[PDB]
Design a protein around this ligand. Sequence first.
Ligand SMILES: [Cu+2]
Ligand SMILES: [Cu+2]
Ligand SMILES: [Cu+2]
Ligand SMILES: [O-]
Length: 439
Amino acid sequence: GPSFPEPKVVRSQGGLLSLKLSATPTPLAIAGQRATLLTYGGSFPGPTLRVRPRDTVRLTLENRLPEPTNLHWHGLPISPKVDDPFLEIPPGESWTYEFTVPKELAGTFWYHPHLHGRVAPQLFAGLLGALVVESSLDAIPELREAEEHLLVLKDLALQGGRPAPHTPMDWMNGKEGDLVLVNGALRPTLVAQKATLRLRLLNASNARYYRLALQDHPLYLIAADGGFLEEPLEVSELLLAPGERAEVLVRLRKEGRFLLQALPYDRGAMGMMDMGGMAHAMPQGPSRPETLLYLIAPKNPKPLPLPKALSPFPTLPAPVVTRRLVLTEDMMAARFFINGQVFDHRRVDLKGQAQTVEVWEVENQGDMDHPFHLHVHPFQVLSVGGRPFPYRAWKDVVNLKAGEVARLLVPLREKGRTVFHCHIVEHEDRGMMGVLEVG
Ligand SMILES: [Cu+2]
Ligand SMILES: [Cu+2]
Ligand SMILES: [Cu+2]
Ligand SMILES: [O-]
């Protein structure tokens, strides 16, 4: 096959993407070994669904797992009557998700389980895939002539040829694995044929962070989680927290081999030590550096000019309400809270009005990073930690380091009951989630 492994793509046909997937235990070859993973469509990652605005998606999920499951269409601004976080598909049963792709939408999205209490083990075991919304913007020469690839960043740990079980410490920290993979492959080689690459990046890990840096090169950020920036933004590195997506252009500067690395990053994970008094909690510190892939540049590379502009960001109405949400931890109990409470599916926490805009101030009073996610209603990050955000784009996950406040502009779109939660999915399973009702 191609030197660079990417998931199989399924495209809409005549404006319709009609597909049956089964969530199933699946024997595979993974990183040179044989293992049984939980997969959609018999692959890890699952197939990439590629659609255009106004397409109809009709996806029948058959549950062939021994436990209930469901889907979350992460990042899609569709109705929570479709993207229903409370729905349970029992073992052996099927459910059809049907929705229309919104008109004003572009970018990289993804699908994964969201059955409360069961997300972390199901996602860890391999249940994920990408969804790409194509854009008329993809036709501009500076993007059309770039070489495009999807990078699904997901780590894994295996024990006895199956995903490693969660330990108590894993429920506290979020589980990370020693196999740090791209598209389910261990350190693949990308032999570029063009001097400009357009990389769509997805962090589909439970808890691992990727502080991305390409040796000797900057990255040009052109999209965040849920849409394009207004113009490319040059960055030296790019942190991708769990659940986040980005698209970057890479302009290869000379012939050679360049490592794409996940550089050391301390997200505040904890360990335990006993030094004669003790036992107490002690910081794990930064992650060890990882090589993600080897990027080979072509001969005499002459990158395309960057796009001068991408997509203008919508002018939003003045906001009608300010919310303040506070995240806290009880680490030794592996319990996690929003405004002092754990999730209760019967309890509505926030009530808002459709087609109004809210300001959400999300404050991390814990010591760990927490990547905050809101379903259904993409937001504009205004500032984090008191620093203004350097671009305007739609996001649906925002990382908060210890002590930081994120200020979000949140237009409320579809009516109904939905959720917001930490996307370290162990923390969501352990209570860090709340309910928003839009009417
Ligand atoms: Cu998600
Ligand atoms: Cu968290
Ligand atoms: Cu969710
Ligand atoms: O989620």
